Design a protein around this ligand. Structure first.
Ligand SMILES: CCN(CC)CCNC(=O)c1c(C)[nH]c(/C=C2\C(=O)Nc3ccc(Cl)cc32)c1C
Lengths: 266, 309
């Protein structure tokens, strides 16, 4: 306690988040022997009026919800800042798509838990700024929690009002893109160059769920994907939508997708 | 009525300090109740005055701060909002809450000690940084021995804290300038002895943060006497010239914004001049190749002119 090198209590092991997040490891607390996820960020010029870093940290310390990844604390020796957080060994929602497609029973359940996470953040006047399948993670019991980094971009899941210059209604748009991502495996205009997409989003019509899917699903996506942010529903209204209220499958039901991936990789 | 809410929260807090829970439920619900009195549907002008007067007479403010660890997470956040709201409460040209904290000084010392407890350290800073906005409250802490505990908190190796105890450290030395200048004028020898250790710290953040504040303090028009005493000491010039060299870029950059004060001094001393001439040439060459981009060089020329003359 107080003035002690982070490695004295937290040790590093592997490297999860395949270079995706800013260098995140798997680790244990040498005292409690329980698993955690450690992110190390260099500080020595890399940056250095990147000081506003507290924004990500202060907000994380203000976030207390079972639908958001919890923040345990941050430590520094000189260079290299250690950010310790919750560990979710169930992988991301994108990793559950790699084996195959998802039935609407699972998709409706996941979006129900994402909305709960958005319901908390918006009530705390905080914005996630980056909603997608990669940032939606699961535990081993099937608990769906959102990410953490960025709370207060990634084209394809952007809102048109953000590109033109990020009110909380933009997260609803990103949720609408994610709804398509859960049903297609990839966001609309995925094969296009991300820069071209930034030019087409505010100008063209909002994407639509096409194919052999249910209408409440296609109506749910239509509701979120509205170029006028005023007409986009809240995170509380969508919890009462037809597509969500139908399937009342618990979070433990999402353990089937966790197992399907652990056998897929063989 | 607020009078009933205070008494309901006062009795429930006495329970905490298995069969608990009920108290934790009451504490949580009553903390929210107080918040809606101060904020709302718009807060009523007499509801906040009945509440504040009952907080003084019951001594609940000192109670919540003391047993802050026992409160739940959301509760700790609610306590801060309730605390900061009545602290800003004014009755004409007076501030009744501030006058109350002056009578209950331990409330300030309790918040200050909160940095040693991580569970409430962040909350104990948000409330502390509000108190020091008022000069009478900022004065009690400044001339207290607990003020020197800040030099331990700023290098506490707990990043979410530490910096928070540094933001309070700056706000105590910069906000009330006449108050700070008086303190530095008297406590010069002890303060800068402690401050010197921050400039020799094995911490990139702590070192450059202290180096930035040091630049602001000396340059401020109120700390003139403190400045002239600092830029006359030989070691203070030796230290700045050393930081100008190796290690970091931003550190050697801020070392420049303090080193120039030594040079700009029209009242140099012989010990400060024997250093500038025994190392006469090297400075002229090092400044010409001093790094090196988009800001600055107009100062790097006038300094050369001074060392040359
Ligand atoms: C076999 C795993 N499979 C192939 C790699 C997919 C699961 N991916 C991981 O290894 C992984 C794990 C075990 N954890 C994570 C992400 C975590 C994590 O484990 N904790 C955590 C806290 C906050 C945030 Cl924003 C993100 C995370 C990831 C991306």
């Amino acid at each position: 306690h107080s003035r002690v090198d982070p490695e004295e209590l937290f040790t590093k092991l592997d490297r999860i988040g395949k270079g995706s997040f800013g260098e995140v490891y798997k680790g244990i607390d040498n005292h409690t022997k329980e698993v955690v996820a450690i992110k190390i960020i260099d500080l020595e010029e890399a940056e250095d009026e990147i000081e506003d870093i507290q924004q990500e940290i202060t907000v994380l310390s203000q976030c207390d919800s079972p639908y958001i990844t919890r923040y345990f604390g941050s430590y520094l020796k000189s260079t290299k800042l250690w950010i310790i957080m919750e560990y979710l060994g169930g992988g991301s929602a994108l990793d559950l798509l790699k084996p195959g497609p998802l039935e609407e029973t699972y998709i409706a359940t996941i979006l129900r838990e994402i909305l709960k996470g958005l319901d908390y953040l918006h009530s705390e006047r905080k914005i996630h700024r980056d909603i997608k399948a990669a940032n939606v993670l699961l535990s081993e019991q099937g608990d769906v929690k959102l990410a953490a980094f960025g709370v207060a971009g990634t084209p394809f899941w952007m809102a048109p009002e953000v590109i033109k210059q990020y009110d909380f209604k933009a997260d609803i748009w990103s949720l609408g893109i994610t709804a398509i991502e859960l049903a297609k495996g990839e966001p609309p205009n995925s094969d296009l160059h991300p820069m071209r997409v930034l030019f087409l989003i505010p100008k063209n019509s909002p994407p639509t769920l096409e194919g052999q899917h249910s209408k409440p699903f296609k109506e749910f996506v239509e509701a979120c994907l509205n170029k006028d942010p005023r007409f986009r529903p809240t995170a509380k209204e969508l919890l009462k939508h037809k597509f969500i209220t139908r399937y009342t499958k618990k979070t433990s039901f999402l353990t089937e997708l966790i197992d399907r991936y652990k056998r897929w990789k063989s | 009525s607020p009078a009933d809410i205070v008494k309901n929260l006062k009795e429930s807090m006495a329970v905490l300090e298995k069969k608990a829970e009920k108290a934790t439920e009451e504490v949580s619900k009553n903390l929210v109740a107080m918040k809606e009195i101060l904020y709302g549907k718009e807060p009523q002008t007499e509801a906040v005055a009945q509440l504040a007067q009952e907080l003084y007479n019951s001594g609940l403010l000192s109670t919540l701060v003391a047993d802050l660890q026992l409160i739940d997470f959301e509760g700790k956040k609610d306590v801060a909002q309730i605390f900061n709201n009545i602290l800003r409460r004014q009755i004409g040209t007076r501030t009744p809450t501030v006058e109350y904290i002056c009578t209950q000084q331990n409330i300030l010392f309790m918040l200050l000690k909160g940095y040693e407890s991580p569970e409430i350290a962040l909350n104990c800073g948000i409330m502390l940084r509000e108190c020091i906005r008022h000069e009478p409250l900022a004065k009690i802490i400044l001339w207290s021995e607990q003020f020197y505990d800040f030099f331990r908190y700023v290098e506490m190796s707990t990043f979410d804290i530490a910096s928070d105890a540094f933001a309070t450290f700056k706000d105590l030395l910069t906000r009330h300038k006449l108050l700070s200048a008086e303190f530095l004028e008297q406590h010069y020898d002890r303060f800068f002895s402690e401050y010197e250790k921050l400039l020799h710290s094995e911490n990139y953040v702590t070192k450059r943060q202290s180096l930035k504040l040091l630049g602001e303090l000396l340059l401020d028009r109120h700390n003139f006497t403190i400045m002239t005493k600092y830029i006359s000491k030989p070691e203070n010039l030796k230290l700045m010239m050393n930081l100008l060299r190796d290690k970091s870029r931003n550190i050697q950059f801020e070392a420049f914004h303090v080193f120039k004060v030594f040079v700009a001094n029209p009242n140099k001393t012989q010990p400060i001049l024997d250093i500038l001439l025994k190392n006469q040439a090297k400075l002229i060459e090092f400044l010409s190749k001093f790094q090196n981009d988009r800001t600055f060089n107009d100062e790097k020329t006038y300094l050369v002119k001074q060392i040359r003359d």
